[PDB]
Amino acid sequence: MQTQSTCPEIPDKTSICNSDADCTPGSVDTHSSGVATGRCVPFNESVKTCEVAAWCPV
C-alpha cells in the first residue's frame, strides 16, 4: 500500500497556478482529488504550479 504525499501539481499548457493572493489551499482541482496547499511555485521555467497533496513518487 501507499500514502498521500505533498508536492507541486504537474504543470499543464491549460492548467496554470497564480500568485499566493490567487492561490488557496483545500481543493480546487476535483480531478486531482488532492489537498491544495496554497503556496505557488515555478514548477518549470516558463510554467508555474501550486503545491498540493496527492500521490507522488518516492
Side-chain angles (χ1 to χ4, degrees):
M1 63 270 172
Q2 289 290 109
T3 328
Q4 177 187 79
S5 326
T6 175
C7 44
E9 208 272 322
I10 304 296
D12 305 305
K13 272 277 176 76
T14 56
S15 204
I16 331 301
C17 172
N18 299 268
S19 289
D20 71 304
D22 276 24
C23 213
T24 66
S27 74
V28 180
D29 296 1
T30 185
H31 182 257
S32 173
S33 90
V35 190
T37 317
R39 272 194 207 193
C40 192
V41 305
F43 193 109
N44 224 233
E45 294 180 281
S46 305
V47 189
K48 51 188 165 193
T49 67
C50 241
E51 257 92 296
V52 305
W55 313 100
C56 260
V58 62

Short mmCIF file of all heavy atoms in Angstrom, two decimals:
data_model
loop_
_atom_site.label_atom_id
_atom_site.label_comp_id
_atom_site.label_asym_id
_atom_site.label_seq_id
_atom_site.Cartn_x
_atom_site.Cartn_y
_atom_site.Cartn_z
N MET A 1 0.83 -1.20 0.00
CA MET A 1 0.00 0.00 0.00
C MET A 1 0.86 1.26 0.00
O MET A 1 2.09 1.18 0.08
CB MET A 1 -0.93 0.01 1.22
CG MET A 1 -0.19 0.04 2.54
SD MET A 1 0.18 -1.61 3.18
CE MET A 1 1.24 -1.20 4.56
N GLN A 2 0.22 2.41 -0.09
CA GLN A 2 0.93 3.69 -0.10
C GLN A 2 0.15 4.75 0.66
O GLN A 2 -0.94 4.49 1.18
CB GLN A 2 1.18 4.14 -1.54
CG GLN A 2 2.22 3.31 -2.27
CD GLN A 2 3.62 3.52 -1.74
OE1 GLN A 2 4.19 2.64 -1.10
NE2 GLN A 2 4.18 4.69 -2.00
N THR A 3 0.71 5.96 0.72
CA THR A 3 0.06 7.07 1.41
C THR A 3 0.17 8.36 0.61
O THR A 3 1.07 8.51 -0.22
CB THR A 3 0.68 7.29 2.81
OG1 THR A 3 1.12 6.04 3.35
CG2 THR A 3 -0.34 7.93 3.75
N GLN A 4 -0.75 9.28 0.85
CA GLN A 4 -0.76 10.56 0.15
C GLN A 4 0.40 11.44 0.61
O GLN A 4 0.64 11.59 1.81
CB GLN A 4 -2.08 11.29 0.38
CG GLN A 4 -2.14 12.66 -0.27
CD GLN A 4 -3.40 13.43 0.10
OE1 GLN A 4 -3.49 14.00 1.19
NE2 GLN A 4 -4.37 13.44 -0.80
N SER A 5 1.12 12.02 -0.34
CA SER A 5 2.25 12.89 -0.04
C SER A 5 2.02 14.30 -0.57
O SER A 5 1.05 14.55 -1.29
CB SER A 5 3.54 12.30 -0.63
OG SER A 5 3.51 10.89 -0.60
N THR A 6 2.92 15.21 -0.22
CA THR A 6 2.82 16.59 -0.66
C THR A 6 3.81 16.88 -1.79
O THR A 6 4.94 16.40 -1.78
CB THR A 6 3.09 17.57 0.50
OG1 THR A 6 3.09 18.92 0.01
CG2 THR A 6 4.42 17.27 1.17
N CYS A 7 3.37 17.68 -2.76
CA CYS A 7 4.21 18.03 -3.90
C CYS A 7 3.48 18.99 -4.83
O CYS A 7 2.25 19.07 -4.86
CB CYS A 7 4.62 16.78 -4.67
SG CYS A 7 3.27 15.58 -4.93
N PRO A 8 4.26 19.75 -5.62
CA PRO A 8 3.71 20.72 -6.58
C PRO A 8 3.00 20.05 -7.75
O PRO A 8 3.59 19.23 -8.45
CB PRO A 8 4.95 21.48 -7.06
CG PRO A 8 6.08 20.52 -6.87
CD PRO A 8 5.73 19.72 -5.65
N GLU A 9 1.74 20.40 -7.95
CA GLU A 9 0.95 19.83 -9.04
C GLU A 9 1.69 19.94 -10.37
O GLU A 9 2.41 20.91 -10.61
CB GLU A 9 -0.41 20.53 -9.14
CG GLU A 9 -1.51 19.65 -9.71
CD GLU A 9 -1.58 19.71 -11.22
OE1 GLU A 9 -1.40 20.81 -11.78
OE2 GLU A 9 -1.83 18.65 -11.84
N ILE A 10 1.51 18.95 -11.23
CA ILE A 10 2.17 18.94 -12.53
C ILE A 10 1.67 20.08 -13.41
O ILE A 10 0.47 20.32 -13.53
CB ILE A 10 1.93 17.60 -13.27
CG1 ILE A 10 2.41 16.43 -12.41
CG2 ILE A 10 2.65 17.61 -14.61
CD1 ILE A 10 3.90 16.44 -12.14
N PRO A 11 2.61 20.80 -14.03
CA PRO A 11 2.29 21.93 -14.91
C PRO A 11 1.63 21.49 -16.21
O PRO A 11 2.00 20.47 -16.78
CB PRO A 11 3.65 22.57 -15.19
CG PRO A 11 4.63 21.45 -15.00
CD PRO A 11 4.06 20.57 -13.93
N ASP A 12 0.65 22.26 -16.67
CA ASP A 12 -0.06 21.95 -17.90
C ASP A 12 -0.21 23.19 -18.77
O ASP A 12 -0.25 24.32 -18.27
CB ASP A 12 -1.43 21.36 -17.59
CG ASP A 12 -1.35 20.15 -16.67
OD1 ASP A 12 -0.62 19.20 -17.01
OD2 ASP A 12 -2.01 20.17 -15.62
N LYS A 13 -0.29 22.99 -20.08
CA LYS A 13 -0.44 24.09 -21.02
C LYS A 13 -1.80 24.75 -20.88
O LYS A 13 -2.04 25.83 -21.42
CB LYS A 13 -0.25 23.59 -22.46
CG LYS A 13 1.20 23.62 -22.93
CD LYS A 13 1.59 25.00 -23.43
CE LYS A 13 3.06 25.05 -23.81
NZ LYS A 13 3.33 24.39 -25.12
N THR A 14 -2.70 24.09 -20.14
CA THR A 14 -4.04 24.61 -19.93
C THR A 14 -4.30 24.88 -18.45
O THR A 14 -5.23 25.60 -18.09
CB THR A 14 -5.11 23.64 -20.46
OG1 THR A 14 -4.95 22.35 -19.86
CG2 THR A 14 -5.03 23.52 -21.97
N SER A 15 -3.47 24.29 -17.60
CA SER A 15 -3.61 24.46 -16.15
C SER A 15 -2.39 25.17 -15.57
O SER A 15 -1.29 24.62 -15.54
CB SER A 15 -3.79 23.10 -15.47
OG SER A 15 -4.46 23.24 -14.23
N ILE A 16 -2.60 26.40 -15.11
CA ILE A 16 -1.52 27.19 -14.52
C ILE A 16 -1.86 27.62 -13.10
O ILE A 16 -3.03 27.63 -12.71
CB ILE A 16 -1.21 28.43 -15.37
CG1 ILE A 16 -1.53 28.17 -16.84
CG2 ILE A 16 0.25 28.84 -15.21
CD1 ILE A 16 -0.75 27.02 -17.44
N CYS A 17 -0.84 27.99 -12.34
CA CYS A 17 -1.03 28.43 -10.96
C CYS A 17 -0.80 29.93 -10.83
O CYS A 17 0.09 30.49 -11.48
CB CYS A 17 -0.08 27.67 -10.03
SG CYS A 17 -0.07 28.30 -8.32
N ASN A 18 -1.60 30.58 -9.99
CA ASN A 18 -1.48 32.02 -9.78
C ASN A 18 -0.72 32.31 -8.49
O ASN A 18 -0.33 31.40 -7.77
CB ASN A 18 -2.87 32.66 -9.73
CG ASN A 18 -3.64 32.48 -11.02
OD1 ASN A 18 -3.58 33.33 -11.92
ND2 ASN A 18 -4.36 31.38 -11.13
N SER A 19 -0.52 33.60 -8.21
CA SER A 19 0.20 34.02 -7.01
C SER A 19 -0.53 33.55 -5.76
O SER A 19 -1.67 33.08 -5.82
CB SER A 19 0.36 35.54 -6.99
OG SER A 19 1.28 35.97 -7.98
N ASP A 20 0.13 33.69 -4.61
CA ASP A 20 -0.46 33.29 -3.34
C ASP A 20 -1.79 33.99 -3.11
O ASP A 20 -2.71 33.42 -2.52
CB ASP A 20 0.50 33.60 -2.19
CG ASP A 20 0.61 35.09 -1.92
OD1 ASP A 20 0.95 35.84 -2.86
OD2 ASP A 20 0.37 35.51 -0.77
N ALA A 21 -1.89 35.24 -3.57
CA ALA A 21 -3.11 36.01 -3.41
C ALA A 21 -4.22 35.48 -4.32
O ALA A 21 -5.38 35.88 -4.20
CB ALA A 21 -2.85 37.48 -3.72
N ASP A 22 -3.86 34.57 -5.22
CA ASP A 22 -4.83 33.99 -6.14
C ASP A 22 -4.89 32.47 -5.96
O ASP A 22 -5.69 31.79 -6.61
CB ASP A 22 -4.46 34.33 -7.58
CG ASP A 22 -5.00 35.68 -8.01
OD1 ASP A 22 -5.22 36.54 -7.12
OD2 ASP A 22 -5.18 35.89 -9.22
N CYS A 23 -4.04 31.95 -5.09
CA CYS A 23 -4.00 30.51 -4.83
C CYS A 23 -4.35 30.21 -3.37
O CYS A 23 -3.77 30.78 -2.45
CB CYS A 23 -2.61 29.95 -5.16
SG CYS A 23 -2.63 28.25 -5.79
N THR A 24 -5.31 29.31 -3.17
CA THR A 24 -5.74 28.93 -1.83
C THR A 24 -5.73 27.42 -1.66
O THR A 24 -5.96 26.66 -2.60
CB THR A 24 -7.15 29.47 -1.53
OG1 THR A 24 -8.11 28.83 -2.38
CG2 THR A 24 -7.21 30.97 -1.72
N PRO A 25 -5.46 26.97 -0.43
CA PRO A 25 -5.41 25.54 -0.10
C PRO A 25 -6.79 24.89 -0.14
O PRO A 25 -7.76 25.51 -0.58
CB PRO A 25 -4.85 25.52 1.33
CG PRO A 25 -5.22 26.85 1.89
CD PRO A 25 -5.17 27.81 0.74
N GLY A 26 -6.87 23.65 0.33
CA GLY A 26 -8.14 22.94 0.33
C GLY A 26 -8.28 21.99 -0.84
O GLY A 26 -7.68 20.92 -0.86
N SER A 27 -9.08 22.39 -1.82
CA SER A 27 -9.31 21.56 -3.00
C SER A 27 -9.96 22.37 -4.12
O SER A 27 -11.11 22.80 -4.00
CB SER A 27 -10.19 20.36 -2.65
OG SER A 27 -11.54 20.75 -2.46
N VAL A 28 -9.22 22.58 -5.20
CA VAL A 28 -9.72 23.34 -6.34
C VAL A 28 -9.81 22.47 -7.59
O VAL A 28 -10.58 22.75 -8.50
CB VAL A 28 -8.83 24.56 -6.64
CG1 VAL A 28 -9.37 25.34 -7.83
CG2 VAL A 28 -8.72 25.46 -5.41
N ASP A 29 -9.00 21.42 -7.62
CA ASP A 29 -8.99 20.50 -8.76
C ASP A 29 -9.71 19.20 -8.42
O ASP A 29 -9.11 18.26 -7.90
CB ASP A 29 -7.55 20.20 -9.18
CG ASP A 29 -6.82 21.44 -9.67
OD1 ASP A 29 -7.43 22.53 -9.66
OD2 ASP A 29 -5.64 21.32 -10.07
N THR A 30 -11.00 19.16 -8.71
CA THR A 30 -11.81 17.97 -8.44
C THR A 30 -11.23 16.74 -9.12
O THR A 30 -11.46 15.61 -8.69
CB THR A 30 -13.27 18.16 -8.91
OG1 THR A 30 -14.06 17.03 -8.52
CG2 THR A 30 -13.33 18.34 -10.42
N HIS A 31 -10.46 16.96 -10.18
CA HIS A 31 -9.84 15.87 -10.92
C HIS A 31 -8.57 15.39 -10.22
O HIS A 31 -8.15 14.24 -10.39
CB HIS A 31 -9.51 16.31 -12.34
CG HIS A 31 -8.91 15.22 -13.18
ND1 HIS A 31 -7.56 15.15 -13.47
CD2 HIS A 31 -9.48 14.16 -13.80
CE1 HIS A 31 -7.33 14.09 -14.23
NE2 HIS A 31 -8.48 13.47 -14.44
N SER A 32 -7.97 16.27 -9.42
CA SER A 32 -6.75 15.93 -8.69
C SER A 32 -7.07 15.16 -7.42
O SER A 32 -6.30 14.30 -6.99
CB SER A 32 -5.98 17.21 -8.35
OG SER A 32 -4.87 16.91 -7.52
N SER A 33 -8.22 15.47 -6.82
CA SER A 33 -8.64 14.81 -5.59
C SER A 33 -7.58 14.94 -4.51
O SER A 33 -7.49 14.11 -3.60
CB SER A 33 -8.93 13.33 -5.86
OG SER A 33 -7.77 12.54 -5.66
N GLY A 34 -6.77 15.99 -4.61
CA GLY A 34 -5.72 16.22 -3.63
C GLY A 34 -6.05 17.34 -2.67
O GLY A 34 -7.17 17.86 -2.67
N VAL A 35 -5.08 17.72 -1.84
CA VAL A 35 -5.28 18.79 -0.87
C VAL A 35 -4.40 19.99 -1.19
O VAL A 35 -3.20 19.98 -0.94
CB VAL A 35 -4.97 18.31 0.56
CG1 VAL A 35 -5.41 19.35 1.58
CG2 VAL A 35 -5.65 16.97 0.83
N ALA A 36 -5.01 21.03 -1.75
CA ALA A 36 -4.29 22.24 -2.10
C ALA A 36 -3.56 22.82 -0.90
O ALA A 36 -4.08 22.81 0.22
CB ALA A 36 -5.24 23.28 -2.69
N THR A 37 -2.34 23.31 -1.12
CA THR A 37 -1.54 23.89 -0.05
C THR A 37 -1.67 25.41 -0.03
O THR A 37 -1.60 26.03 1.03
CB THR A 37 -0.05 23.51 -0.20
OG1 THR A 37 0.07 22.13 -0.55
CG2 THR A 37 0.70 23.78 1.09
N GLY A 38 -1.85 26.00 -1.20
CA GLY A 38 -1.98 27.45 -1.30
C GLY A 38 -0.72 28.11 -1.80
O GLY A 38 -0.78 29.11 -2.53
N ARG A 39 0.43 27.57 -1.41
CA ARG A 39 1.72 28.12 -1.83
C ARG A 39 2.01 27.77 -3.29
O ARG A 39 2.02 26.60 -3.67
CB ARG A 39 2.84 27.60 -0.93
CG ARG A 39 3.07 28.44 0.31
CD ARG A 39 4.38 28.09 0.99
NE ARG A 39 4.36 28.37 2.42
CZ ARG A 39 5.45 28.40 3.18
NH1 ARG A 39 6.64 28.16 2.65
NH2 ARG A 39 5.34 28.66 4.48
N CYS A 40 2.26 28.80 -4.10
CA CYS A 40 2.55 28.60 -5.51
C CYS A 40 4.05 28.71 -5.77
O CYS A 40 4.75 29.50 -5.13
CB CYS A 40 1.80 29.63 -6.36
SG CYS A 40 1.81 29.27 -8.14
N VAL A 41 4.54 27.92 -6.72
CA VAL A 41 5.96 27.93 -7.07
C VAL A 41 6.16 27.61 -8.55
O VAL A 41 5.40 26.85 -9.15
CB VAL A 41 6.75 26.93 -6.22
CG1 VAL A 41 6.53 27.19 -4.74
CG2 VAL A 41 6.36 25.50 -6.58
N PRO A 42 7.21 28.19 -9.14
CA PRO A 42 7.54 27.97 -10.56
C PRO A 42 8.05 26.56 -10.82
O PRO A 42 9.25 26.30 -10.79
CB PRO A 42 8.65 28.99 -10.82
CG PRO A 42 9.27 29.23 -9.49
CD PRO A 42 8.16 29.10 -8.48
N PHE A 43 7.12 25.64 -11.08
CA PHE A 43 7.47 24.25 -11.36
C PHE A 43 8.52 24.16 -12.46
O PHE A 43 9.60 23.60 -12.26
CB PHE A 43 6.22 23.46 -11.76
CG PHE A 43 6.44 21.97 -11.77
CD1 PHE A 43 5.85 21.17 -10.81
CD2 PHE A 43 7.23 21.38 -12.74
CE1 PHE A 43 6.04 19.80 -10.81
CE2 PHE A 43 7.42 20.01 -12.75
CZ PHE A 43 6.83 19.22 -11.78
N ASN A 44 8.20 24.72 -13.62
CA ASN A 44 9.12 24.70 -14.76
C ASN A 44 9.70 26.09 -15.01
O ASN A 44 9.54 27.00 -14.19
CB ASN A 44 8.40 24.20 -16.01
CG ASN A 44 9.23 23.20 -16.79
OD1 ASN A 44 9.45 23.36 -17.99
ND2 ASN A 44 9.69 22.16 -16.11
N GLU A 45 10.38 26.25 -16.14
CA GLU A 45 10.98 27.52 -16.50
C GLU A 45 9.92 28.53 -16.93
O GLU A 45 9.78 29.60 -16.33
CB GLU A 45 12.00 27.33 -17.62
CG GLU A 45 13.21 26.51 -17.22
CD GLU A 45 14.20 26.33 -18.35
OE1 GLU A 45 13.96 25.47 -19.22
OE2 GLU A 45 15.22 27.05 -18.37
N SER A 46 9.16 28.18 -17.96
CA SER A 46 8.11 29.05 -18.47
C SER A 46 6.74 28.60 -17.98
O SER A 46 5.72 28.89 -18.59
CB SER A 46 8.13 29.07 -20.00
OG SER A 46 9.41 29.43 -20.49
N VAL A 47 6.73 27.88 -16.86
CA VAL A 47 5.49 27.39 -16.28
C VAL A 47 5.55 27.39 -14.75
O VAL A 47 6.62 27.25 -14.17
CB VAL A 47 5.17 25.97 -16.77
CG1 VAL A 47 3.77 25.55 -16.33
CG2 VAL A 47 5.31 25.87 -18.28
N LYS A 48 4.40 27.56 -14.12
CA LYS A 48 4.32 27.58 -12.66
C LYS A 48 3.09 26.82 -12.17
O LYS A 48 2.03 26.87 -12.80
CB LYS A 48 4.29 29.02 -12.15
CG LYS A 48 3.23 29.88 -12.83
CD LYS A 48 3.36 31.34 -12.43
CE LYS A 48 2.56 32.24 -13.36
NZ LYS A 48 2.93 33.67 -13.18
N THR A 49 3.23 26.13 -11.05
CA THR A 49 2.13 25.36 -10.47
C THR A 49 1.98 25.66 -8.99
O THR A 49 2.78 26.38 -8.40
CB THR A 49 2.34 23.85 -10.67
OG1 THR A 49 3.46 23.40 -9.90
CG2 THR A 49 2.56 23.52 -12.14
N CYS A 50 0.94 25.09 -8.38
CA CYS A 50 0.68 25.29 -6.96
C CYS A 50 0.91 24.00 -6.18
O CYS A 50 0.78 22.90 -6.72
CB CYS A 50 -0.75 25.78 -6.75
SG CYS A 50 -0.87 27.41 -5.95
N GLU A 51 1.26 24.14 -4.90
CA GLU A 51 1.51 22.99 -4.05
C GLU A 51 0.20 22.29 -3.69
O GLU A 51 -0.79 22.93 -3.35
CB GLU A 51 2.24 23.42 -2.77
CG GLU A 51 3.72 23.09 -2.78
CD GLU A 51 4.57 24.23 -3.30
OE1 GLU A 51 4.42 24.59 -4.49
OE2 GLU A 51 5.39 24.77 -2.52
N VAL A 52 0.22 20.96 -3.76
CA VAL A 52 -0.97 20.17 -3.44
C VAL A 52 -0.58 18.81 -2.85
O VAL A 52 0.55 18.35 -3.03
CB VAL A 52 -1.84 19.94 -4.68
CG1 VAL A 52 -2.21 21.27 -5.32
CG2 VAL A 52 -1.13 19.04 -5.68
N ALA A 53 -1.52 18.19 -2.15
CA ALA A 53 -1.28 16.88 -1.54
C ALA A 53 -1.91 15.77 -2.37
O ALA A 53 -3.13 15.66 -2.45
CB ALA A 53 -1.81 16.86 -0.12
N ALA A 54 -1.06 14.93 -2.97
CA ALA A 54 -1.54 13.82 -3.78
C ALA A 54 -0.54 12.68 -3.79
O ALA A 54 0.46 12.71 -3.06
CB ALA A 54 -1.82 14.29 -5.20
N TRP A 55 -0.80 11.67 -4.61
CA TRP A 55 0.08 10.51 -4.71
C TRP A 55 1.32 10.84 -5.55
O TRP A 55 1.24 10.92 -6.78
CB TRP A 55 -0.66 9.33 -5.33
CG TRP A 55 -2.01 9.10 -4.71
CD1 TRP A 55 -3.22 9.48 -5.23
CD2 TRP A 55 -2.29 8.43 -3.48
NE1 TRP A 55 -4.23 9.09 -4.38
CE2 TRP A 55 -3.69 8.45 -3.30
CE3 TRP A 55 -1.50 7.82 -2.50
CZ2 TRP A 55 -4.31 7.88 -2.19
CZ3 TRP A 55 -2.11 7.26 -1.40
CH2 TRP A 55 -3.51 7.29 -1.25
N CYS A 56 2.45 11.02 -4.88
CA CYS A 56 3.70 11.33 -5.56
C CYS A 56 4.71 10.21 -5.39
O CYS A 56 4.60 9.37 -4.49
CB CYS A 56 4.28 12.64 -5.03
SG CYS A 56 3.94 14.09 -6.08
N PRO A 57 5.72 10.18 -6.27
CA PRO A 57 6.78 9.16 -6.24
C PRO A 57 7.70 9.33 -5.04
O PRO A 57 7.72 10.37 -4.39
CB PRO A 57 7.54 9.40 -7.54
CG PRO A 57 7.30 10.84 -7.87
CD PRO A 57 5.91 11.14 -7.37
N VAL A 58 8.47 8.28 -4.75
CA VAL A 58 9.40 8.31 -3.62
C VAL A 58 10.78 7.82 -4.04
O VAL A 58 10.94 7.22 -5.10
CB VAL A 58 8.89 7.45 -2.45
CG1 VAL A 58 8.77 5.99 -2.87
CG2 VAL A 58 9.81 7.58 -1.25
#
